[PDB]
Amino acid sequence: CGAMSTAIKKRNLEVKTQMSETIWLEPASERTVFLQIKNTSDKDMSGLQGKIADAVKAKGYQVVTSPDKAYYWIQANVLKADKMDLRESQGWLNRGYEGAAVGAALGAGITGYNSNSAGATLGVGLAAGLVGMAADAMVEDVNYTMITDVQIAERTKATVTTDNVAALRQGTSGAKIQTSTETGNQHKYQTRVVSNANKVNLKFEEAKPVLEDQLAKSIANILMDI
Amino acid sequence: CGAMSTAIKKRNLEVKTQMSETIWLEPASERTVFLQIKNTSDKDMSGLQGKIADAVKAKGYQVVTSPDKAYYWIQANVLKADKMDLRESQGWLNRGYEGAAVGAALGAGITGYNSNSAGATLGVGLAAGLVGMAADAMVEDVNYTMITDVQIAERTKATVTTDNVAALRQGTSGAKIQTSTETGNQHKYQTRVVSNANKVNLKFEEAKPVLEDQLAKSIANILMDI
Amino acid sequence: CGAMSTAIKKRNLEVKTQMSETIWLEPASERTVFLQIKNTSDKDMSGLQGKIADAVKAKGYQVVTSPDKAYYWIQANVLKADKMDLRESQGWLNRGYEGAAVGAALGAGITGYNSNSAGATLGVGLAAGLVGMAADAMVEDVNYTMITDVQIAERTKATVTTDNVAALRQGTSGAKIQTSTETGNQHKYQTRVVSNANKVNLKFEEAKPVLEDQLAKSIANILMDI
Amino acid sequence: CGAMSTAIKKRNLEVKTQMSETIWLEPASERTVFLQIKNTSDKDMSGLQGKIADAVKAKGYQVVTSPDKAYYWIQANVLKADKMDLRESQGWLNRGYEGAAVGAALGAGITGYNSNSAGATLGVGLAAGLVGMAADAMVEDVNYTMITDVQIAERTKATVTTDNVAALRQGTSGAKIQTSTETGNQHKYQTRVVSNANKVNLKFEEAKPVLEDQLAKSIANILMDI
Amino acid sequence: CGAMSTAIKKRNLEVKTQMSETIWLEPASERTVFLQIKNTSDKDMSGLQGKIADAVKAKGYQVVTSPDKAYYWIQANVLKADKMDLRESQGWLNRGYEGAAVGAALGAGITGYNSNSAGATLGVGLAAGLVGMAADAMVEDVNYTMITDVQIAERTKATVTTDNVAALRQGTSGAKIQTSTETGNQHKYQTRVVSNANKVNLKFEEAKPVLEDQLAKSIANILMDI
Amino acid sequence: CGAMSTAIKKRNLEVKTQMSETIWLEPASERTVFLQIKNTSDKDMSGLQGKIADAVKAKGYQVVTSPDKAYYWIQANVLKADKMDLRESQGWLNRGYEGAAVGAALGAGITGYNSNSAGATLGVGLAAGLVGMAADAMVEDVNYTMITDVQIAERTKATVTTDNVAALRQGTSGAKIQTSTETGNQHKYQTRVVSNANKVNLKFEEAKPVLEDQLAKSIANILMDI
Amino acid sequence: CGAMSTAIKKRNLEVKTQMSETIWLEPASERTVFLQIKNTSDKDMSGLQGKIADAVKAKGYQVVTSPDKAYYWIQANVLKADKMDLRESQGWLNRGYEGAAVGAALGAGITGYNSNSAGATLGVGLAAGLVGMAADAMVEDVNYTMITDVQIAERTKATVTTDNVAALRQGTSGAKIQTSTETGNQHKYQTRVVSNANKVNLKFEEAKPVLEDQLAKSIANILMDI
Amino acid sequence: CGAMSTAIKKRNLEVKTQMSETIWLEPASERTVFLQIKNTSDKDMSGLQGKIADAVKAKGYQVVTSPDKAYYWIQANVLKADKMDLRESQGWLNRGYEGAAVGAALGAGITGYNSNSAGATLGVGLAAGLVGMAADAMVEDVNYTMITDVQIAERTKATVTTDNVAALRQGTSGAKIQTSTETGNQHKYQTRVVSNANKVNLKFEEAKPVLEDQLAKSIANILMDI
Amino acid sequence: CGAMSTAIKKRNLEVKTQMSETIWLEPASERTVFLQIKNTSDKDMSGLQGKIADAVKAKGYQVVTSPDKAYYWIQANVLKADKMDLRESQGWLNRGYEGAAVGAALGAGITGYNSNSAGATLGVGLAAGLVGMAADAMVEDVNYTMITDVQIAERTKATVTTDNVAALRQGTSGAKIQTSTETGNQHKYQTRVVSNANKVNLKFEEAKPVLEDQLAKSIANILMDI
């Protein structure tokens, strides 16, 4: 019952995109944005940069190819992606014991009353039980989790001091501490977006365009309209 | 029994809006408000800005389109939205085992006494049990959770110093610390509003106007009347 | 049932590569990269350096053999690799008791009704039960976990101070603390990549080319295109 | 069933070598290495030093017998070694109760139907049960764990200050704190390697050459090729 | 079954010696060692000092009787020794209930079918059950644990400052703090060695020579060869 | 069964003496020791001082009666002693229920078949059960725990500053803090010795000479021979 | 069975006296002691002061009635005393249910076979069960716990500064902090003695002389002989 | 059985008085005491002040009515008093279910064999069961707990500084901190006394004189005799 | 049984008043008190101020209406009051299941033997069971908890500094810190009184006069008599 229940509940693709924290931007009249999209995950998001540019341009901004003449920077990295089956947390039922029991009972029942003979009701029941167990194992609640790191840069008139601190671990004994200081006129803020795609026997190709569309809109909505 | 019990209990739309903390504002005679509404969530709240303006104007304030000549700022961001089924926390009953048992017993019972024959009471019972299990899976206690970040700005005669501190994580080794200082005559306060919409098989389109109305009134009620 | 369920679920090779943290790099026009790939693990990844160079060159960079004339350094070390069987966490079922019970019942059942005689149904059942238990033990959900440490170096105009701190443990009594200070014009950042390969009775030779391909792309994608 | 299941699963020698942490070394053109290998454990690793020298020489380095004219030092100590039986964590089954039950049932069964007589089926069953329990106790999942401490020294142009701090515990009352300071031109880093050897009824002599080979390669791979 | 299972598993003497931490010594050309071995435990280790001297001399060092002309000091104290029975952690089975049940069943069984009479099968069964319970109690998994504190002294050219801090507890109210400072040219490091000897009904006299041999080699192996 | 099992296992006196921590003493040519032995416990250890003097003199030292002309001080206090029954941690079995059940069954069994009559088998069984319960209560695993505080003083050339800090609790409100400072040429170190004596129905008089002998040797072994 | 088991085990008075911590006193030739014994507990210890004086005088000291000409002070306070029944921690068995069951069964059994009649076996059984329950309630494992605070004063040549700190709690709002400083030539140390007296149905009058004798010896043994 | 067991065990009044901490007073020749006794509890302790004066005068002190000419102050406050039933922690048995079961069985048993008729055995049993349940509820293990705060003042020659610190909580926002400093020649110490009175169906009037007597003696015993 | 057991146990009104902490007041000859009683709770305590004045006047003090000429201030606020049913913590028994079972059994029993007929014993039993369940629900162990904050002010000659610190929370972002300093000659102390009133089906009107009387006496008893 668990296999078909999962199939009915998760019959439709469900995509959820959740931004971790709110980045507040001062009102301004500038409309130049520079984009820098990376993907260090093992899954394809090649269409993300184009969709972000379209969403940003639809809000009244102009996308420039050189970062020096851009008032805003949108830096995004699709950091990691994970795949898991939600049925695996239900216990031993996900293994296929329930599917085997239903198949075995159906095979013996359909043979025990119709042409019972002797031994035939065991061979058919075993074959049906094996098929039932196999069919249970082929149904999984596939869930795709994606993590995207977003960095937004805004130009400012105030002097901004950037202190780079890095504790480069060297072994089990210690680390190499690197320090430097630079000044500029740019404020940088970071935020994280978590994406989820869920469907029965979901293939990432089907969920890829929807994940890109929702992720692009969420990142582009940090900027104010016009 | 769980499916119909959920349907009866959650037959009506229930919307709850809860502000996290109270923002205290000094009494004043100014009535100029600037609005800035964002939506980084994956759900539509396009009518929120208009409803906030109507609620603010109904309290005696004047909405201005330029932030420089506004005594008050209302900055709101619909940060994230989540959907979950409350029946999923009830255990294995939500899977559909209870629905299958009721359907199987009804199918066998209606056939065991009326035209029992042989084998017929099993085929009808299995079909009825499958339908009963399927009907249980199609009933869910849909709950929508929404998080909205609110920032309120108030002009003041005192000098306000803003120190921007950002620890931009760079990897597993360290971070880039950004610091800057600016002065102004504006006080900013933050608060959070949590919204909930609950109904059986709820679609967000039905709950969207109610969520917007309650959220707009809650945010606009931070300001005093007149 | 657990043995064949594992075989069906894990019938295909699944490789997952996940970068731990995002390294942000400033936009630049330099395209010289120096590579330094190490492997202190007990498994072969000899093709990793060549695949990283191909992926880096495909993005518009030029690989140089001398570190002094390289704007970027990519230092990677395949630190450790582990092998485990996921079925071992299922309990006593992984031992082979379930396989023995199925084999014993099948052996006695196929003999109890056909040529029952006396004592024969026990010898066949014991032999079939032993074979069933043996076949269960030969099926394992092999999972390979690999840890890779990545260090990225970027040239900068700012003066960078490196303080080496090492607490070399000397016994149970204390340690020898080593300190030194050097200056340079290079920023170094660290990150970690976790790789997983899963299949039934998986041999590392089959998963080696896929692990190298995914790891090379993930590391090379830290750099921006062109 | 546990005894033969362990024998089948652990029928082949499995050796795992895992370095705890990554030691990063700056690129250089020096190729002189000094070796210093110790063994304070109770197990023989006499061939480790020779295998490290061969692996180091195969990577293009020259091994020198005097530490003063060596750019690199490789100091390794096989600190401790432990032996344990993995079956001991399975519970009372490892004691031999399961083996006794199988032997007792087989002895009584083979006698209860063939020449039952009286009392004979108890003497044979008891003898077979004792043999079955004894055979279970002679099968163990032997696992050898080895800990190796590694210290790597690299010459540098920077001045290195070494502060020796030792809190020599004197009783339950206090300690004798020893402090000293020396300067030099050598950086030292520490790391740890954990080795595991697993097989049914494993003897350390069989696993000794494999442990030495994997440990030597792991330590020598800290150095870059050529 | 537990008694004979323990006898078979622990039929051979097993001695394990594990050094807690690694003491690193700089390479040097000195070969003078001074020994100072103490034993505050309740067990005899009179042969430890002689075996340490033999192991040290076999590595190329010269043992001197006066500490002032020794480059190295080896100070060892056999601090404490403990004896425990590993069967005591198995529960009530170690008491002898299992042995009584086997003896009682054997006594009644051997009499119930052969010369049953009346009352005789109870007297023999009770006597056999008592003997079986007694034999179970005489079998124990004897484990000897030994703790040895090791202090190694090395001459150095640097000035070494020793600060003696002792918080001598005086009652429940406070303590007497003693402080002093001395200077010297000797570095001292501490480490701990844990020894284990396990056998069925083990007597410490049998395990004494093996414990001394392994402990002496472990301590002497802190020094480099030649 | 628990009563006789305890009697067999603990039939012999077992004395364990364990020093808590190691006190390290510098090599020296002095051989004058002053003894000061106290006993604040409730048990007799009158022979401890004489045995310590004999053990110290057997190692080449000379015992002096005046502390001013002694290079070493040995101050020991037998602080506390405790007595407990190890069978009390076994549960309700130590109460005597098991002994009553065995006695009641034996009384009824020996009467139920031989001269059964009526009512006689109950009076004899009750009397035998009461005796069996009483005999169980008279068997206890007596364990004696003793704590001894040891303070060792050594003359030194360095100036030793003793700061006496005492927080004399005055009530629930506060305390009276006492502070003083003195200088001297004597180092004091503290350690603790834990003694255990275990036997069935053990009387402290039997274990007293063995406890004194082991305690005296352990304390005297802090000093080096000759 | 619990009632008589407790009576047999605790048939003899057992008194345990345990000093919490060791007070170390420097060797000296003075023999003047001043005593000050208090008793704030609810139990009589009137003979404690006399027994302490006798024990102190037996060790060679002279007791003086004026504190100004005494080198040593012994200040003791019997702080508190508690009484508890150890059977109360055994559960519901201590209530008397076990005693009622034994009495009820004995009453019905002695009447069911001898002059059974009708109804008589219930009246006798109820009366015997009530008596059995009552007798169980009259047996208790009485344990007396006593806490004694000890303060020892020793004259010294060093200047001793006493800082009195008292945080006198004034309500739920705060406290009144009292501070003062005095100088003197006397060192004070504190320790605690815990006394236990255990017997079945123990009356404190029987345990009073033994508690006084053990407490007096323990306190007087802080001083060295002669 | 629980009701009568409680009645037998707690048939006599038991009063326990325990002082929390020891207040140490320097020996002196002054004998003037000023008393100040308060009672903020809800129970009557009107006789406490008179009994303290009698106990103090019996020890050789003189009670004065004006605090300025008193060397000692005894300030006591009976802070709070609580009443609880110890049977309430036994579970549902204290409710009266056990009493109802005994009464119901007795009523049915006395009627089932004597004049059974029909229905009569139910009416009598119900009435007897109700009476039995009612009688169980009227028996309670009444325990009275009393807390007394004691403050003792002693004149001194040293200057005493009293710093009054009070954090008067003002709301959920903050507090009003009050600070002041005064000097005097009086030391104040605080301690707490806990009193317990236990009996079946105890009325506080019966326990009042005993509580006063024990409390008065405990407080007066802080002072030394004469 | 739970309903009537609660009715019998709680048949009488029980009022408990407990002061949290003791406020110590210096002896003085002043007798002017100013009262200020507030009640922010939802329950009526209108008679509290009059009863406090009567209790204060009965102790020899004079109540003044102007705070400036009062040596003592008594400020009290009845902060909050809560009502709860103690039967609600007993579990499902408080719901009324036990009452329904008793009523159903009584209804069926009184009809099953007298005029059994058919179906009549079910209608009467259901009606009686419903009445029994209803009667159980109408019985509750009503407990009223009241919290009273007390502030006592005392005039003093010392200068008292009051620092007002208030952290007025402004939102989720921060707070507004208010600070001020004033000087005066008045000490203020705070304490808390907890009041409890318990009875079956208790109405607050019945417990109001008793709560006022006990609360007034407790607060007035902080002051010394005369």
Side-chain angles (χ1 to χ4, degrees), chain B residues 172-187:
Chain B
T172 67
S173 36
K176 281 151 146 33
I177 325 286
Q178 277 196 334
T179 39
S180 65
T181 291
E182 332 191 68
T183 63
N185 286 115
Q186 196 179 62
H187 270 133

PDB file of all heavy atoms in Angstrom, chain B residues 172-187:
ATOM      1  N   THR B 172      35.894  27.267   3.798  1.00  0.00           N
ATOM      2  CA  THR B 172      36.015  26.613   5.090  1.00  0.00           C
ATOM      3  C   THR B 172      37.140  27.199   5.930  1.00  0.00           C
ATOM      4  O   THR B 172      37.283  26.825   7.097  1.00  0.00           O
ATOM      5  CB  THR B 172      36.240  25.109   4.906  1.00  0.00           C
ATOM      6  OG1 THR B 172      37.517  24.886   4.298  1.00  0.00           O
ATOM      7  CG2 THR B 172      35.157  24.516   4.024  1.00  0.00           C
ATOM      8  N   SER B 173      37.926  28.117   5.370  1.00  0.00           N
ATOM      9  CA  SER B 173      39.107  28.645   6.042  1.00  0.00           C
ATOM     10  C   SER B 173      38.814  29.926   6.814  1.00  0.00           C
ATOM     11  O   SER B 173      39.248  30.072   7.960  1.00  0.00           O
ATOM     12  CB  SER B 173      40.223  28.890   5.023  1.00  0.00           C
ATOM     13  OG  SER B 173      39.697  29.346   3.791  1.00  0.00           O
ATOM     14  N   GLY B 174      38.093  30.865   6.209  1.00  0.00           N
ATOM     15  CA  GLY B 174      37.840  32.126   6.877  1.00  0.00           C
ATOM     16  C   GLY B 174      36.735  32.962   6.271  1.00  0.00           C
ATOM     17  O   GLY B 174      35.761  32.429   5.733  1.00  0.00           O
ATOM     18  N   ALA B 175      36.876  34.281   6.360  1.00  0.00           N
ATOM     19  CA  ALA B 175      35.855  35.198   5.875  1.00  0.00           C
ATOM     20  C   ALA B 175      36.506  36.535   5.557  1.00  0.00           C
ATOM     21  O   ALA B 175      37.637  36.811   5.962  1.00  0.00           O
ATOM     22  CB  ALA B 175      34.729  35.370   6.898  1.00  0.00           C
ATOM     23  N   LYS B 176      35.774  37.361   4.818  1.00  0.00           N
ATOM     24  CA  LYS B 176      36.183  38.726   4.505  1.00  0.00           C
ATOM     25  C   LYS B 176      35.297  39.669   5.308  1.00  0.00           C
ATOM     26  O   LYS B 176      34.084  39.730   5.082  1.00  0.00           O
ATOM     27  CB  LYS B 176      36.074  39.001   3.008  1.00  0.00           C
ATOM     28  CG  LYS B 176      37.219  38.435   2.190  1.00  0.00           C
ATOM     29  CD  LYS B 176      36.771  38.098   0.781  1.00  0.00           C
ATOM     30  CE  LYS B 176      37.877  38.341  -0.230  1.00  0.00           C
ATOM     31  NZ  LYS B 176      39.224  38.067   0.338  1.00  0.00           N
ATOM     32  N   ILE B 177      35.897  40.397   6.241  1.00  0.00           N
ATOM     33  CA  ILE B 177      35.159  41.294   7.122  1.00  0.00           C
ATOM     34  C   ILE B 177      35.110  42.679   6.493  1.00  0.00           C
ATOM     35  O   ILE B 177      36.152  43.274   6.198  1.00  0.00           O
ATOM     36  CB  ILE B 177      35.803  41.347   8.516  1.00  0.00           C
ATOM     37  CG1 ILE B 177      36.371  39.979   8.895  1.00  0.00           C
ATOM     38  CG2 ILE B 177      34.796  41.818   9.549  1.00  0.00           C
ATOM     39  CD1 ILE B 177      35.320  38.961   9.255  1.00  0.00           C
ATOM     40  N   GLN B 178      33.902  43.195   6.297  1.00  0.00           N
ATOM     41  CA  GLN B 178      33.688  44.522   5.737  1.00  0.00           C
ATOM     42  C   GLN B 178      33.131  45.437   6.816  1.00  0.00           C
ATOM     43  O   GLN B 178      32.193  45.063   7.526  1.00  0.00           O
ATOM     44  CB  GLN B 178      32.730  44.470   4.546  1.00  0.00           C
ATOM     45  CG  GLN B 178      33.390  44.105   3.236  1.00  0.00           C
ATOM     46  CD  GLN B 178      32.524  44.438   2.042  1.00  0.00           C
ATOM     47  OE1 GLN B 178      31.300  44.490   2.146  1.00  0.00           O
ATOM     48  NE2 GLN B 178      33.155  44.659   0.898  1.00  0.00           N
ATOM     49  N   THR B 179      33.708  46.629   6.939  1.00  0.00           N
ATOM     50  CA  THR B 179      33.282  47.601   7.936  1.00  0.00           C
ATOM     51  C   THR B 179      33.189  48.978   7.299  1.00  0.00           C
ATOM     52  O   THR B 179      34.028  49.342   6.469  1.00  0.00           O
ATOM     53  CB  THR B 179      34.243  47.637   9.128  1.00  0.00           C
ATOM     54  OG1 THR B 179      35.592  47.508   8.664  1.00  0.00           O
ATOM     55  CG2 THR B 179      33.935  46.504  10.091  1.00  0.00           C
ATOM     56  N   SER B 180      32.165  49.735   7.686  1.00  0.00           N
ATOM     57  CA  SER B 180      31.999  51.109   7.239  1.00  0.00           C
ATOM     58  C   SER B 180      31.136  51.843   8.253  1.00  0.00           C
ATOM     59  O   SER B 180      30.441  51.227   9.064  1.00  0.00           O
ATOM     60  CB  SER B 180      31.374  51.184   5.842  1.00  0.00           C
ATOM     61  OG  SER B 180      30.055  50.674   5.847  1.00  0.00           O
ATOM     62  N   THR B 181      31.192  53.172   8.204  1.00  0.00           N
ATOM     63  CA  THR B 181      30.458  54.011   9.144  1.00  0.00           C
ATOM     64  C   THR B 181      29.832  55.171   8.389  1.00  0.00           C
ATOM     65  O   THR B 181      30.516  55.858   7.626  1.00  0.00           O
ATOM     66  CB  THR B 181      31.377  54.529  10.255  1.00  0.00           C
ATOM     67  OG1 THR B 181      31.768  53.439  11.099  1.00  0.00           O
ATOM     68  CG2 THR B 181      30.665  55.574  11.094  1.00  0.00           C
ATOM     69  N   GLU B 182      28.534  55.382   8.596  1.00  0.00           N
ATOM     70  CA  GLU B 182      27.828  56.527   8.040  1.00  0.00           C
ATOM     71  C   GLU B 182      26.964  57.152   9.124  1.00  0.00           C
ATOM     72  O   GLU B 182      26.576  56.498  10.094  1.00  0.00           O
ATOM     73  CB  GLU B 182      26.957  56.147   6.833  1.00  0.00           C
ATOM     74  CG  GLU B 182      27.447  54.950   6.039  1.00  0.00           C
ATOM     75  CD  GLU B 182      26.714  54.787   4.722  1.00  0.00           C
ATOM     76  OE1 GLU B 182      26.890  55.643   3.829  1.00  0.00           O
ATOM     77  OE2 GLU B 182      25.955  53.806   4.583  1.00  0.00           O
ATOM     78  N   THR B 183      26.673  58.438   8.954  1.00  0.00           N
ATOM     79  CA  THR B 183      25.817  59.175   9.869  1.00  0.00           C
ATOM     80  C   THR B 183      24.567  59.646   9.142  1.00  0.00           C
ATOM     81  O   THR B 183      24.590  59.907   7.936  1.00  0.00           O
ATOM     82  CB  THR B 183      26.545  60.378  10.483  1.00  0.00           C
ATOM     83  OG1 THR B 183      26.908  61.299   9.449  1.00  0.00           O
ATOM     84  CG2 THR B 183      27.791  59.927  11.225  1.00  0.00           C
ATOM     85  N   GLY B 184      23.473  59.745   9.889  1.00  0.00           N
ATOM     86  CA  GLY B 184      22.206  60.165   9.328  1.00  0.00           C
ATOM     87  C   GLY B 184      21.270  60.604  10.431  1.00  0.00           C
ATOM     88  O   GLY B 184      21.652  60.706  11.598  1.00  0.00           O
ATOM     89  N   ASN B 185      20.026  60.866  10.043  1.00  0.00           N
ATOM     90  CA  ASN B 185      18.984  61.313  10.959  1.00  0.00           C
ATOM     91  C   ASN B 185      17.752  60.432  10.824  1.00  0.00           C
ATOM     92  O   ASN B 185      16.617  60.907  10.752  1.00  0.00           O
ATOM     93  CB  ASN B 185      18.636  62.776  10.707  1.00  0.00           C
ATOM     94  CG  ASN B 185      19.706  63.722  11.210  1.00  0.00           C
ATOM     95  OD1 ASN B 185      20.347  64.421  10.428  1.00  0.00           O
ATOM     96  ND2 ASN B 185      19.907  63.745  12.521  1.00  0.00           N
ATOM     97  N   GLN B 186      17.967  59.121  10.790  1.00  0.00           N
ATOM     98  CA  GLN B 186      16.886  58.171  10.585  1.00  0.00           C
ATOM     99  C   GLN B 186      17.111  56.941  11.450  1.00  0.00           C
ATOM    100  O   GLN B 186      18.202  56.368  11.456  1.00  0.00           O
ATOM    101  CB  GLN B 186      16.786  57.773   9.109  1.00  0.00           C
ATOM    102  CG  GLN B 186      15.486  57.109   8.719  1.00  0.00           C
ATOM    103  CD  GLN B 186      15.443  56.757   7.249  1.00  0.00           C
ATOM    104  OE1 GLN B 186      16.247  55.962   6.767  1.00  0.00           O
ATOM    105  NE2 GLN B 186      14.506  57.353   6.525  1.00  0.00           N
ATOM    106  N   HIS B 187      16.071  56.540  12.173  1.00  0.00           N
ATOM    107  CA  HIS B 187      16.091  55.347  13.008  1.00  0.00           C
ATOM    108  C   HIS B 187      15.371  54.224  12.279  1.00  0.00           C
ATOM    109  O   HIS B 187      14.286  54.436  11.732  1.00  0.00           O
ATOM    110  CB  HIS B 187      15.418  55.604  14.357  1.00  0.00           C
ATOM    111  CG  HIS B 187      16.349  56.096  15.418  1.00  0.00           C
ATOM    112  ND1 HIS B 187      16.051  57.169  16.228  1.00  0.00           N
ATOM    113  CD2 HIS B 187      17.572  55.662  15.803  1.00  0.00           C
ATOM    114  CE1 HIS B 187      17.049  57.375  17.068  1.00  0.00           C
ATOM    115  NE2 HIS B 187      17.985  56.474  16.830  1.00  0.00           N
TER     116      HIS B 187
END
